[PDB]
Amino acid sequence: APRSVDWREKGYVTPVKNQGQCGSCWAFSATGALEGQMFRKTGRLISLSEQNLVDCSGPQGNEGCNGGLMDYAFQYVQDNGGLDSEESYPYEATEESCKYNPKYSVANDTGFVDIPKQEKALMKAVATVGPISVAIDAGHESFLFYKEGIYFEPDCSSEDMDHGVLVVGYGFESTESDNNKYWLVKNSWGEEWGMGGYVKMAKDRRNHCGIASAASYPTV
Numbered sequence: 001a002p003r004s005v006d007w008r009e010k011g012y013v014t015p016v017k018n019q020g021q022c023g024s025c026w027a028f029s030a031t032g033a034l035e036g037q038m039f040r041k042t043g044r045l046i047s048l049s050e051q052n053l054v055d056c057s058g059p060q061g062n063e064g065c066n067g068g069l070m071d072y073a074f075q076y077v078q079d080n081g082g083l084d085s086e087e088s089y090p091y092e093a094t095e096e097s098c099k100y101n102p103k104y105s106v107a108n109d110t111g112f113v114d115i116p117k118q119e120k121a122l123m124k125a126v127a128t129v130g131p132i133s134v135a136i137d138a139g140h141e142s143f144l145f146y147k148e149g150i151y152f153e154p155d156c157s158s159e160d161m162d163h164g165v166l167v168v169g170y171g172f173e174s175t176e177s178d179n180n181k182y183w184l185v186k187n188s189w190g191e192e193w194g195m196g197g198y199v200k201m202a203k204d205r206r207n208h209c210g211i212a213s214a215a216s217y218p219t220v
């Protein structure tokens with residue numbers, strides 16, 4: 001695997017979005033991964049409808065604004081046989097009756113792949129596949145108010161992941177402690193959070209915040 005990867009500059013990543021007052025991080029993590037793979041496939045970058053996931057992926061076991069799983073969204077897409085674009089079915093940070101329209105579908109998936117649950121397996125996936133859906137332990141105020149730098153939180157749990165985000169790459173930086181490899185992570189809380197909406201999460205410090213523990217991508 002290369003020492004550095006950043007899919008953003010290869011055109012694989014849409015603008016940072018803001019889930020707002022809806023517990024939909026899983027849906028943003030899911031669209032971002034599907035967006036990267038549709039782009040690998042068609043050469044076209046099209047924003048996908050989180051709302052469409054929020055409103056409709058209930059039979060796959062998502063709970064709308066009360067939460068869900070990325071795997072669950074990928075199955076939805078597969079079972080549904082398509083997914084509407086963002087602009088055909090725009091995001092409203094609530095849940096409403098399913099409004100899916102096959103006419104505006106712009107994306108599909110044939111399933112999904114779970115990646116082996118350690119960081120080296122994740123690095124290869126990110127290197128060869130593209131943006132990868134992951135959950136982290138985001139339940140600490142240091143993360144809620146993250147600004148800049150490699151994020152490292154001492155009581156983060158490798159087992160207590162609570163928040164789906166999107167690994168768009170990875171690399172390295174100079175640091176006083178020479179722990180300076182990071183994962184490049186796209187969040188769904190707005191441009192004003194982190195570094196334009198992104199956080200650098202420590203990498204190869206013992207699966208920090210459990211980033212390698214629940215990582216998957218859809219197959220298109």
Ligand SMILES: N#CC1(NC(=O)[C@@H]2Cc3ccc(c(Cl)c3)OC/C=C/COc3ccc(C4CNC4)cc3C(=O)N2)CC1
Pocket residue numbers: 022023024025026061062063065066067068069070071134135136161162163164214
């Ligand atoms: N925004 C936001 C909120 N948070 C979530 O939506 C979280 C995101 C998540 C957390 C850990 C993950 C993944 Cl892939 C995703 O990795 C492994 C852990 C999975 C266990 O978590 C669940 C099991 C099942 C469910 C479904 C049953 N109710 C939805 C939901 C969850 C869930 O908690 N989803 C609602 C506040």
Ligand SMILES: [Cl-]
Pocket residue numbers: 023024025163
């Ligand atoms: Cl959230």
Ligand SMILES: [Zn+2]
Pocket residue numbers: 017047048049050051086091
């Ligand atoms: Zn959207």
Ligand SMILES: [Zn+2]
Pocket residue numbers: 092096
């Ligand atoms: Zn509405």
Ligand SMILES: [Zn+2]
Pocket residue numbers: 071113114214215216
């Ligand atoms: Zn999975």
Ligand SMILES: [Zn+2]
Pocket residue numbers: 139140141142153154155156
């Ligand atoms: Zn903490």
Ligand SMILES: [Zn+2]
Pocket residue numbers: 137139140155156157160
């Ligand atoms: Zn924690």
Ligand SMILES: [Zn+2]
Pocket residue numbers: 023024025026162163164
């Ligand atoms: Zn979340």
